[PDB]
Structure prediction request, 117 residues.
Amino acid sequence: LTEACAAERVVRPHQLSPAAQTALLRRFPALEGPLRHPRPVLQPFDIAAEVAFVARIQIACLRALGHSIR
Amino acid sequence: RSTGRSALAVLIRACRRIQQQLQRTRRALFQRSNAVLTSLHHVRMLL
Prediction:
């Protein structure tokens, strides 16, 4: 996933080419998750994907707080 | 003949095996830095 995005200069592999997506999928089959899921609850291809998993819960409770206080 | 030429079979093979490693030092030293060329572009691929 590095060199298919480094030789193609694809900075983020959701901007990966459609043949360049599936040819990697023909090589390594566990990557159907981070490339072909509509709304994965964990963010695909980010460093803080576990951290952005947490900060939503911090957000979504405050609106559940803030619209309940009203 | 086994003194004059046999002082030269010493020194024909001597140069013709120094020159052969120099083909292999081109190849075994950038396929370690092409992985460096992979990772250094991968730092902005994180970004």
In short: The first helix of chain B runs from residue 9 to 13.
